[PDB]
């Protein structure tokens, strides 16, 4: 009975080493090393094994330390020497990380040399309080019409991308990352958004394909990729979201704006559950520990919009959660839905019905709402949202709607037109003015005479036309952020003449 | 008494005392930290060791680090100086406006009022809101479930209840942010500042805020409701007021208790809830009651997991609820504010023996005509058109302009007394205004304002 | 079983929506067999809603039981160490 | 470091502490000195004074550690057994002291080559017959082995003798013979 | 929940399947005669 | 080397105590005094100089105090060309009764996964000749595929068809690992390969290595046999540069064996009774099965779905480790359609119009859309019947039934089951046939004509003959 | 006391559902194996040994009695749950109260098709 009551320790005490800054492995198994001694070690402090592996002191017990290993178990044997490092876990931060692919500890895994950063930051700092914050007011543009119109995200919000497997969540995140190139290239310094993609428990092939996709779109020069893949130790997959959050909190603290994607938090909760079950912490529902909500909530509260006295920067978080058969009442989906400010919900039936991105607008919500929109998108999207809600009220009457009154048939028609308008192709985010022009064409009624099969082609052709020959009205809408009455008349003229000439 | 940390496992810390073991529920002070860390005793493990739960993060804790016994449970500043301020679970200010300079402190753990301190007949708490006071009235010292979340004016109704209980009854309010989002806590603070309920310049603040954030350990989220209840207890027992206490959210209070109980190694009960679910809820809720000095009325936001009303958390909360206010979006998109659903809001004191035969009959008639009108809408005769007209007028007359919306909407706010509500709905039901247009009742106070709007 | 109950809930929700749409379509085409079809589809939707309510009660009951059973399995596994 | 395992293995708290002391004494070849000092400690603590003093769980641990260090220095004990009693006092395993002593004692008994031999008989057995039995039972042993014979009487075996030499076992009772013959007749 | 009536395999999922096969066996006989 | 003693035996878990030289975790230990070879794999260091090990064979007859010898390395199997045409078990012994496998090098079955810089981003389609797979969820050269399905839906038949088609179309040293599956099926596969020239008993020009640890094996053997097969394939990929095919049936048994030993290793159960380390074990095993810049490994894995759940933690954890998941539905197998692939549940990472072309992508998406609309119209059929639909709804239903039939294809390995002969349909033939059925070019032909045929010409011929008879 | 001293007593337990919940708390804190709805195995004995003490005595024992009216709260009208069925197995009949009746104004909302009194018929007066 007793971890430290091993016969060797007892006979060494009977016979009559520094047990303050140094320890000895009593037992090692499944990534958990019980360490004797280390009487001066702190909770959550990084330690050092004799083989060079690092650990973290999670369980401080009366006679042993429960240390989680940042690597493989085979390099640790009973009796190995453990050292203190005297420090809580910290990562490097700065602009030196933009364009790099690092692991959960800020070590480059792309071969492009060492991260030449000068600043380090603790991964477990507390979020900003009540007073340092201000209300979420500026739009975070994703370039996706359905998101930007019906589920708008602001700078400082925490919007959950939730859905089953293979529904398009990573694609939404990657389109959002690719979109910010227009702002990061231009000169307006407070529309610039730096991105952090945290890959948690994925294939290395998947992250390689993602980094290639971001390099082809020239989105890597302002993106940090943190990857704790599937073959990494559960401590690394547990720590990667906090590393990414500190990398983004650097920007949030220095007057800049960052966006972070946790892809995904389900796998991080699974890694944490493994670490906790092996440390023999009391399991709860689905064997998850008691403080897994605390885990994800103290991770997600660190995304904040700061007031002007604190630099005015922000950190926007887009956590990803995979549900099993649409079950949002599972433990971790429930926690993360409770923590965030709204959720972009993706469906499989919407996916295979031709609706891509498969955003379920009935189930999706943004609690920040229109405060996170521009006045032009606000104008058009209020009408679009009302009309789509009305369509959803009577969408069940479709396949019989030809035998219903003119009001129902018009609701059905306008709804099918707007639904065909919200479709979008992959890796092609739109500017907000172009989205405004397309939604304007849709909600003002210049598509009710058109066939549903032709709405996509009309939208593509009209967008090409207005981008080529109407940069003036586009620039006006973009610079003023609203559709002025002169701009409204010009839009009306453009759309009516195009529809006249359209095939 | 000085102790030393012997174990740190997450948010659970074991502290060994070599003399003077502290009782259970005592707060301990961890020494040598840059921020105040407080541990609350949970068990006596034997061998002079107690097991505690932390109120803040435990990173950087060392075995052997000295821990001081406070000598009492968590003590928070209580007084009129807490009004308009924000404090966390352990009573320190989190709004950066300086210390809270009250004269006395109260422990957040207290026994409920005794048997002989209880009021023996139920009275009504008049809020000045027409739909609430009429159809689903609140009882003094009762618990009210507030259903409906975002987009239905929950914060406007909260602030209007604060304002109306401050004006009509002279009783202050306490808001407890149990598991609050920090963004929405900042939002609430600033909406309360802009609606005058909080005043940063003089002592006319009407509400005290207690925030237990979502990024705090489960112990803090399990005790923030007690902190708010302790402030409200002060206002009731020392100043004989009728206090309002808001607990948003109560499901998060249950969830934090479940998490704390799981951290302490206790075997979960049904659906994963703490085995002590009913007794935790009871020890909290029984302090919300009418005593002989004053009363504490509690509006509590209910979240229902999986829309399952037989879930243990709602089923245990519903055993204490005396009323229910359902904020419906089908009522808000209809144009009515406050968006209270008049057919789904209930009350236990909607009983002739409690509110009087006249009140009961007016309320029953209003509800019956609204149900009839829903039926008639479902089919769209002789007098059914008149029922439709009277029910549209009743629907409009349930609306009301609020004082906390005056700066934004421009309309004056109305605090309708109970008799004026009863008689106005009675008259509309009898037919005394079957000639006036239905939009002469929309967004007015008493029925005299309806006839005055019909004149124009 | 939870999956059987979810299958049946989904099926009856679909039946209820279809009969409601058929009731509306018969109400339009009626403006003697059309009246009979309108009332019949109204009754079918009402019966489907009652079956949906009873099955929703059964489903919530069964999911609470499943969560409790899995917790008890995990607890009993941990207590045997 | 490498630990020296005793010839027999005991388990539990008592087994671990006894194995520890055995290895630590074989490190310094003081087995008999610490053996008799543990016997002295066991008789010291078992007398109701020290038993009631050290088995009391509300009096502080350090106070009884100091008292045990006092009483183990006063009686001229080796540093080995002294820090052994100190270790039992810090871990709070003073209750397991008699168990540690017993485990060490049986370890050293099998280290002396003592094998526990039991000879069950129906009646109180003859003394010269029992000496001849001793002489014959010494034949089942290796060298350096001595027979610690304790013969208890079970009259229900009807005759013969049931002998157990450590774990070896011969069932020469006659009841076994009659039961075998009954099983043979019925089957 | 599309096609959840047939996926639940009830008295309605069997009624649906029987209809699809009856209608399309009659169509196939009318489409093979001409073919 | 180090010598220890067995101190505990509880099932397939054996504790060994060492005096000198505790062996590291993952080492193989040899139990001395056994007529057959019993290998113990070190799992945990328990303290007190004891390790806890999992046995690769049965533990009957083991005695406390039995001596154990440390190998000084993990399980080391023979790797090389000489493994081709042979069958080996989890520990590398030949189980085909054809003598020792004499290779020049041995490789440890526990190795690190390739780094991030070693990944390759190339995605080229691997045409299989199966219509539904080629069209809706095409496979990639050097990608991980994965075949999900319950019991009796067709995972084994489909993996044997893929073996047939690709592995003989291939010239690059396939590997098949039989993980916790039936021994009758292993004998059947061995003899089909000997008969079809893929395994050459004499004149060793064989091109497939076989590794088999079947149901009757203890959990340790079924948990490490996938790693043994992986190690053979890894040698072929790395130290020869060859392009390799790895077939694993069934990979669920790796996880199941882990769960079977989990509790006896002292681990609190996770959800659904799985070990707490399910995801990281699956990850350390699956991240080695990958194409690097050194060489290609095209991996086809059969994945058992317990009780047809697909939300069970084992298939749900396998899903993220694949590049083209093919999901076999029991509801489609009950319709008589084979292969039972679910068209609305199978996904490929190269189903991209910038990879396969706009014609293929548009045809696949139109097929999936018409099948989803058919799913929705079945409700209204159930309530109203088929005669009260619009005519365009009837057209949708008719074309959807034809597309369902035409997705089915007769296999060469299924002639004993089907009677029909096998068909191997090219990619453009598939795209063209489905494009024509979508465009409405065969609304005059009956739906049964498309069932169990190859290309669309076979469909028109079958329709002609049915018209002749019926 | 009254039952054994020749007098008659009536006892109401309001309610035994919360007493079973209190006992489940005590049992789970003692780390006893939970069963249906996490209730201990002896939650039936908890109520059975109690409600057995309500008895009518013969005249050689004083002739007194003790009547028990235990109260049980169901969830969404489910009377086939664990604790309701336990108490139904213990008692001599039940008075069902329905919510659908109580809302419609039928009060006391007694379901007459489901309520029963197994041994009370012999007690009803002749006029009634
Ligand atoms: N707007 C779109 N249009 C067309 N195809 C899309 C669109 N979005 C996603 N896809 C495709 O759907 C497939 C699945 O999308 P994706 O992998 O990004 O989502 P996911 O939920 O993260 O998948 P996983 O379960 O593997 O994590 C991809 O092949 C992707 O290319
Ligand atoms: N492609 C097929 N064609 C015809 N029948 C098939 C086909 N695949 C499977 N079957 C039938 O289903 C049975 C199950 O075969 P199998 O491949 O062993 O499924 P699994 O391995 O998933 O349990 C087969 O014996 C066969 O009867
Ligand atoms: Mg993804
Ligand atoms: Mg098979």
Q: How far is the CA of F287 from the centre of ligand 4 (A)?
A: 24
Q: How far is the CA of A321 from the centre of ligand 3 (A)?
A: 9
Domain holding A357, by residue range, is 91-376
Is F207 within 8 Å of F244 (Cβ atoms)?
A: no
Q: How far is the CA of F290 from the centre of ligand 4 (A)?
A: 23
Determined by cryo-EM
**Residues F265 and F371 occupy one common structural domain:** no
Q: Which of G92, G81, G1, G97 is nearest to G43 (CA)?
A: G81
Is F137 within 8 Å of F325 (Cβ atoms)?
A: yes
Neighbours of F115 (CB within 10 A): 11
Does the C-beta of A356 come closer than 6 Å to ligand 1? yes
Is A378 within 8 Å of A365 (Cβ atoms)?
A: no
Q: Which chains form contacts with chain G, at 3 or more CB pairs under 8 Å?
A: B, C
A and D: number of Cβ contacts within 8 A: 42
Chains G and E touch (3+ CB pairs under 8 A): no
Compute the distance between CA of residue B394 and CA of residue G6 in angstroms, rounded to an integer. Answer: 62
- Between helices F391-407 and F358-384, what is the axis angle to 10°? 120
**Residues B418 and B310 occupy one common structural domain:** no
Q: Which of B212, B238, B341 is nearest to B293 (CA)?
A: B238
Measured between CB atoms, does A362 come within 8 Å of chain C? no
Question: Which of A127, A156, A281 minimises the CB distance to B10?
Answer: A281
D residues 88-117 closer than 8 Å to B (CB): 92
B75-78 and B242-248: which strand pairing? Answer: unpaired
Alpha carbon dihedral B276, B278, B280, B286, in 10-degree steps, equals -150
Breakpoints of chain E, after residues (C–N > 2.5 Å): none
Q: Which tokens sit at B142?
A: 């009762």
Q: Which tokens sit at F128?
A: 């299989």
Q: Which residue has the tokens 């089942």?
A: D140
Cα atoms found within 13 Å of the Cα of residue B380, Cβ hemisphere only: 10
Looking at F75, F107, F122, the residue that finishes a domain is F75
Measured between CB atoms, does A319 come within 8 Å of chain B? no
Determine whether the annotation assigns residue B13 to a binding site: no
Alpha carbon dihedral A71, A77, A83, A89, in 10-degree steps, equals 20
- Contact list in C for residue B274 (CB cut-off 8 A) is none
Q: What share of chain G is helix, strand, coil (3-state, %, to 5)?
A: 35, 15, 50
Q: Which tokens sit at B302?
A: 């209910």
Phi and psi based region of residue F303 (left: phi greater than 0; alpha: psi -120 to 50; beta: remaining) = beta
Q: Is F353 among the domain residues?
A: no
Is F406 within 8 Å of F134 (Cβ atoms)?
A: no
Ligand 2 residue neighbourhood (C-beta within 6 Å)? F 149, 151-157, 338-339, 411, 414, 417-418
Q: Which of B214, B293, D1, B347 is nearest to A11 (CA)?
A: D1
With 0-12 / 13-18 / 19 or more C-beta atoms within 10 angstroms meaning exposed / middle / buried, residue B163 is buried
Q: How far is the CA of F155 from the centre of ligand 2 (A)?
A: 7
The reply to whether omega before A357 is within 30° of 0 (cis) is yes
Pocket test for ligand 1, best of A168, A172, A263, A355 (most atoms within 8 A of CB): A168
Ligand 1 atom with minimal separation from the A346 CA: 21
**Residues B80 and B150 occupy one common structural domain:** yes
Question: Which of B275, B278, B315 minimises the CB distance to G29?
Answer: B275
**Residues F209 and F224 occupy one common structural domain:** yes
Q: How many domains is chain B built from?
A: 3
Measured between CB atoms, does D27 come within 8 Å of chain B? no
Q: Measured between alpha carbons, how far is residue B117 from residues B348, C13, G40 in Å?
A: 22, 52, 37
Please enumerate, by residue number, every residue of A annotated as part of a binding site for Mg(2+). 170, 263
Q: Is B352 among the domain residues?
A: no
A365-366 and F105-108: which strand pairing? Answer: unpaired
Residue-wise burial string across B66-98, b where 16 or more C-beta atoms lie within 10 A, e elsewhere: ebebbebbbbbbbbbbbbbbbbbbbbeebbeee
**Residues F146 and F244 occupy one common structural domain:** yes
Q: Which chains form contacts with chain E, at 3 or more CB pairs under 8 Å?
A: C, F
B residues 249-278 closer than 8 Å to C (CB): 267-268, 270-272
Number of the ligand closest to the Cα of F160: 2
Domain holding B26, by residue range, is 2-74
Q: How far is the CA of F156 from the centre of ligand 4 (A)?
A: 4
3-state secondary structure at position A83: strand
Query: What are the start-end ranges of the E strands in A89-244?
Result: 90-93, 101-102, 119-122, 160-163, 193-200, 223-228
Q: Which tokens sit at F54?
A: 């999992």
| Residue C72 to residue G34, Cβ atoms within 8 A | yes
Report H helices in F49-179: 131-136, 155-162, 168-169
**Residues F62 and F104 occupy one common structural domain:** no
Active-site residue flag, A84: no
Q: Which tokens sit at F115?
A: 């780094």
Here the CATH number for the domain that contains residue F147 is 3.40.50.300
Query: Å from C42 to nearest chain A CA?
Result: 15
Q: What residues contact D117, with CB distance under 8 A and at least 6 apart? A: D137, D147, D148, D149, D150, D163, D164, D165, D166
**Residues B150 and B298 occupy one common structural domain:** yes
Determine whether the annotation assigns residue B181 to a binding site: yes
Query: Å from D14 to nearest chain F CA?
Result: 15
Is B27 within 8 Å of B72 (Cβ atoms)?
A: yes
Query: Å from A324 to nearest chain C CA?
Result: 13
Query: Å from A331 to nearest chain C CA?
Result: 10
Measured between CB atoms, does C2 come within 8 Å of chain B? no
Resolution to one decimal, Å: 2.5
Here the CATH number for the domain that contains residue F30 is 2.40.10.170
3-state secondary structure at position A315: strand
Here the CATH number for the domain that contains residue A241 is 3.40.50.300
**Residues F292 and F144 occupy one common structural domain:** yes
Is D98 within 8 Å of D29 (Cβ atoms)?
A: no
Q: What residues contact B452, with CB distance under 8 A and at least 6 apart? A: none
User: Residue B233: beta bridge partners?
Assistant: none
Q: Which of E35, E2, E15, E20 is nearest to F404 (CA)?
A: E20
Ligand 1 atom with minimal separation from the A351 CA: 12
Is G15 within 8 Å of G71 (Cβ atoms)?
A: yes
- Contact list in C for residue B310 (CB cut-off 8 A) is 57, 60-61, 64
Question: Which of G38, G76, G78 minimises the CB distance to C68?
Answer: G38
Q: Which residue, among E16, E18, E25, E34, would best test binding to F if mutated, counting the most F CBs under 10 Å from its CB?
A: E16
Q: Which of A252, A257, A250, A195 is nearest to A226 (CA)?
A: A195
User: Residue F30: beta bridge partners?
Assistant: F39, F69
DSSP state of F164: I
- Contact list in E for residue C7 (CB cut-off 8 A) is 4, 7-9
| Residue A287 to residue C74, Cβ atoms within 8 A | yes
- Contact list in D for residue A8 (CB cut-off 8 A) is 1, 3, 20
Q: Which of B344, B340, B243, B224 is nearest to B298 (CA)?
A: B243
G93-94 and G116-117: which strand pairing? Answer: antiparallel
Q: Is B196 among the domain residues?
A: yes
- Contact list in G for residue C75 (CB cut-off 8 A) is 34
Q: What residues contact B35, with CB distance under 8 A and at least 6 apart? A: B56
Query: Å from A463 to nearest chain C CA?
Result: 38
**Residues F273 and F174 occupy one common structural domain:** yes
Chains D and C touch (3+ CB pairs under 8 A): no
Q: Which of A179, A190, A253 is nearest to A426 (CA)?
A: A179
3-state secondary structure at position G66: strand
Q: Which of A368, A156, A155 is nearest to B150 (CA)?
A: A368
Q: What residues contact B259, with CB distance under 8 A and at least 6 apart? A: A284, A290, A291, A293, A294, B218, B221, B222
Instruction: Tell whether the torsion through CA atoms of A396, A397, A400 and A402 is positive or negative.
Output: negative
Is B227 within 8 Å of B287 (Cβ atoms)?
A: no
- H or E stretch including A460? helix A455-469
Looking at B347, B377, B393, the residue that finishes a domain is B347
Question: Which of G22, G31, G76 minimises the CB distance to B310?
Answer: G76
Compute the distance between CA of residue F383 and CA of residue C16 in angstroms, rounded to an integer. Answer: 10
Here the CATH number for the domain that contains residue F433 is 1.10.1140.10
Phi, psi of B44 (to 5 degrees): -100, 110
Is B308 within 8 Å of C60 (Cβ atoms)?
A: yes
Compute the distance between CA of residue F393 and CA of residue A401 in angstroms, rounded to an integer. Answer: 13
What spatial distance separates the first Cα and last Cα of chain A, rounded to whole Å?
84
Compute the distance between CA of residue B147 and CA of residue B152 in angstroms, rounded to an integer. Answer: 10
Phi and psi based region of residue F156 (left: phi greater than 0; alpha: psi -120 to 50; beta: remaining) = alpha
Active-site residue flag, B154: yes
C residues 3-42 closer than 8 Å to E (CB): 7-8, 10-11, 13-15
**Residues B70 and B80 occupy one common structural domain:** no
| Residue A109 to residue F24, Cβ atoms within 8 A | no
For ligand 1, atom 21, the nearest C-alpha belongs to A166
Neighbours of D56 (CB within 10 A): 11
Is F230 within 8 Å of F288 (Cβ atoms)?
A: yes
**Residues B111 and B131 occupy one common structural domain:** yes
**Residues B456 and B390 occupy one common structural domain:** yes
Is F287 within 8 Å of A205 (Cβ atoms)?
A: no
Pocket test for ligand 1, best of A142, A143, A170, A349 (most atoms within 8 A of CB): A170
Q: Which tokens sit at A117?
A: 């950063």
């Amino acid at each position: 009975t007793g971890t430290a009551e091993m016969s060797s320790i007892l006979e060494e005490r009977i016979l009559g080493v520094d047990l303050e800054e140094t320890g000895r492995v009593l037992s090692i198994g499944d990534g958990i090393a019980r360490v004797h001694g280390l009487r001066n070690v702190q909770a959550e402090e990084m330690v050092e094994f004799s083989s060079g592996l690092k650990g973290m002191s999670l369980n401080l017990e009366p006679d042993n330390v429960g240390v989680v290993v940042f690597g493989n178990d085979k390099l640790i044997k009973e009796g190995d020497i453990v050292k203190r490092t005297g420090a809580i876990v910290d990562v490097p931060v700065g602009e030196e990380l933009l364009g790099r692919v690092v692991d959960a500890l800020g070590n480059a895994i792309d071969g492009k040399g060492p991260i030449g950063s000068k600043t380090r930051r603790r991964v477990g700092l507390k979020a900003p309080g009540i007073i340092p914050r201000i209300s979420v007011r500026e739009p975070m543009q994703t370039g996706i019409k359905a998101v930007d119109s019906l589920v708008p995200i602001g700078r400082g919000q925490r919007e959950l991308i939730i859905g089953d497997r293979q529904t398009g969540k990573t694609s939404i995140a990657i389109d959002t990352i690719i979109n910010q190139k227009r702002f990061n290239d231009g000169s307006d310094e407070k529309k610039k958004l730096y991105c952090i993609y945290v890959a948690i428990g994925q294939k290395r092939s998947t992250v390689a394909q993602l980094v290639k996709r971001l390099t082809d779109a020239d989105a890597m020069k302002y993106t940090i990729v943190v990857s704790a893949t599937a073959s990494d130790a559960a401590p690394l997959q547990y720590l990667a979201p906090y590393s990414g959050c500190s990398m983004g909190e650097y920007f949030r603290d220095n007057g800049k704006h960052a966006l972070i994607i946790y892809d995904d938090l389900s796998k991080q909760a699974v890694a944490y559950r493994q670490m906790s079950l092996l440390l023999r912490r009391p399991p709860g529902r689905e064997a998850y520990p008691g403080d897994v909500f605390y885990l994800h909530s103290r991770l997600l509260e660190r995304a904040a919009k700061m007031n002007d006295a604190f630099g005015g920067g922000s950190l926007t978080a887009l956590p990803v959660i995979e549900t099993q058969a649409g079950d949002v009442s599972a433990y971790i989906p429930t926690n993360v839905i409770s923590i965030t400010d709204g959720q972009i919900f993706l469906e499989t039936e919407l996916f295979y019905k031709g609706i891509r991105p498969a955003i379920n607008v009935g189930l999706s919500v943004s609690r920040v709402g229109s405060a996170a929109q521009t006045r032009a998108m606000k104008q058009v999207a209020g009408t679009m949202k009302l009309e789509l809600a009305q369509y959803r009220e009577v969408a069940a009457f479709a396949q019989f709607g030809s035998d219903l009154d003119a009001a129902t048939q018009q609701l059905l028609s306008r709804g099918v037109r707007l639904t065909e308008l919200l479709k979008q192709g992959q890796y092609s985010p739109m500017a907000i003015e172009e989205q405004v022009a397309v939604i304007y064409a849709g909600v003002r009624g210049y598509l009710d005479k058109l066939e549903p099969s032709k709405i996509t082609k009309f939208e593509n052709a009209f967008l090409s036309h207005v981008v080529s020959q109407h940069q003036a009205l586009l620039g006006t809408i973009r610079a003023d952020g609203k559709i002025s009455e002169q701009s409204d008349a010009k839009l009306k003229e453009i759309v009516t003449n195009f529809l006249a000439g359209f095939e | 008494a000085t102790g030393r940390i012997v174990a740190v496992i997450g948010a659970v810390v074991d502290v060994q005392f070599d003399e003077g073991l502290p009782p259970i529920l005592n707060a301990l002070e961890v020494q040598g930290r840059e921020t105040r860390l407080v541990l609350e005793v949970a068990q006596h493990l034997g061998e002079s060791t107690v097991r505690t739960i932390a109120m803040d993060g435990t990173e950087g804790l060392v075995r052997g680090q000295k821990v001081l016994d406070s000598g009492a449970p968590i003590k928070i500043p209580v007084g009129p100086e807490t009004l308009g301020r924000i404090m966390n679970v352990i009573g320190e200010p989190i709004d950066e406006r300086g210390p809270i300079k009250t004269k006395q402190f109260a422990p957040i753990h207290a026994e409920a009022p005794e048997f002989m301190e209880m009021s023996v007949e139920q009275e009504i708490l008049v809020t000045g809101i027409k739909v609430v006071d009429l159809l689903a009235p609140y009882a003094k010292g009762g618990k009210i479930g507030l259903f409906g979340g975002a987009g239905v004016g929950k914060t406007v109704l909260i602030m209007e209840l604060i304002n109306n209980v401050a004006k009509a009854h002279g009783g202050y309010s306490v808001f407890a942010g149990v598991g609050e989002r920090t963004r929405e806590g900042n939002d609430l603070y600033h909406e309360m500042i802009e609606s005058g309920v909080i005043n940063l310049k003089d002592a006319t603040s009407k509400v005290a805020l207690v925030y237990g954030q979502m990024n705090e350990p489960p112990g803090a989220r399990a005790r923030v409701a007690l902190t708010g209840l302790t402030v409200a207890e002060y206002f009731r027992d020392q100043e004989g007021q009728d206090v309002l206490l808001f607990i948003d959210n109560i499901f998060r209070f249950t969830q934090a208790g479940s998490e704390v109980s799981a951290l302490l190694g206790r075997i979960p009960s049904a659906v994963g809830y703490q085995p002590t679910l009913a007794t935790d809820m009871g020890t909290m809720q029984e302090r919300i009651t009418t005593t002989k000095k004053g009363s504490i009325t509690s509006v509590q936001a209910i979240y229902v997991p999986a829309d399952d009303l037989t879930d243990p958390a709602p089923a245990t909360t519903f055993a204490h609820l005396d009323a229910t206010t359902v904020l419906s979006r089908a009522i808000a998109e209809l144009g009515i504010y406050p968006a209270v659903d008049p057919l789904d809001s209930t009350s236990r004191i909607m009983d002739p023996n409690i509110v009087g035969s006249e009140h009961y009959d007016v309320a029953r008639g209003v509800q019956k005509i609204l149900q009839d009108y829903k039926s008639l809408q479902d089919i769209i005769s002789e007098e059914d058109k008149l029922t439709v007209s009277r029910a549209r007028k009743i629907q409009r007359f349930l609306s009301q302009p609020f004082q906390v919306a005056e700066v934004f909407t421009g309309h004056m706010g109305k605090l309708v007394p109970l008799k004026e509500t009863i008689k106005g709905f009675q008259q509309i039901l009898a037919g005394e205004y079957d000639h006036l247009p239905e939009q002469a009742f929309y967004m007015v106070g008493p029925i005299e304002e309806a006839v005055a709007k019909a004149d124009k | 079983t939870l999956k059987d109950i979810t299958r049946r809930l989904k099926s009856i929700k679909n039946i209820q929506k279809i009969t409601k749409s058929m009731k509306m379509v018969a109400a339009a085409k009626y403006a003697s067999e059309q009246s009979a079809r309108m009332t019949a589809m109204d009754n079918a939707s009402k019966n489907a809603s009652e079956m949906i309510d009873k099955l929703t009660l059964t489903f919530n009951r069964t999911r609470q039981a499943v969560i409790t059973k899995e917790l008890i399995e995990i607890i009993s596994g941990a207590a045997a160490l | 470091a490498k630990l020296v395992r005793p010839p027999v293995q005991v388990y539990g708290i008592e087994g671990r502490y006894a194995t520890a002391l055995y290895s630590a004494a074989s490190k310094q070849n003081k087995l008999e000195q610490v053996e008799k000092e543990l016997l002295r400690v066991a008789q010291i603590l078992k007398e109701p004074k020290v038993a009631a003093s050290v088995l009391n769980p509300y009096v502080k641990r350090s106070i009884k550690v100091k008292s045990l260090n006092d009483i183990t220095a006063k009686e001229r004990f080796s540093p080995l057994t002294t820090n052994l009693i100190n270790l039992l006092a810090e871990n709070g395993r003073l209750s397991n002291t008699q168990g540690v002593v017993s485990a060490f004692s049986t370890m050293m008994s099998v280290h002396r080559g003592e094998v526990p031999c039991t000879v069950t008989s129906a009646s109180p057995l003859e003394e010269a017959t029992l000496s001849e039995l001793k002489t014959v039972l010494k034949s089942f042993l290796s060298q350096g082995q001595v027979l610690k014979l304790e013969a208890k009487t079970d009259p229900s075996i009807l005759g013969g003798m049931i002998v157990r030499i450590g774990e070896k076992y011969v069932d020469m009772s006659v009841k076994t013979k009659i039961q075998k013959l009954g099983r043979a007749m019925r089957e | 929940g599309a096609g959840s009536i047939r996926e639940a395999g009830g008295a309605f999922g069997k009624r649906e399947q029987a209809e699809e096969e009856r209608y399309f066996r009659a169509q196939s006989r009318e489409q093979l005669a001409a073919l």
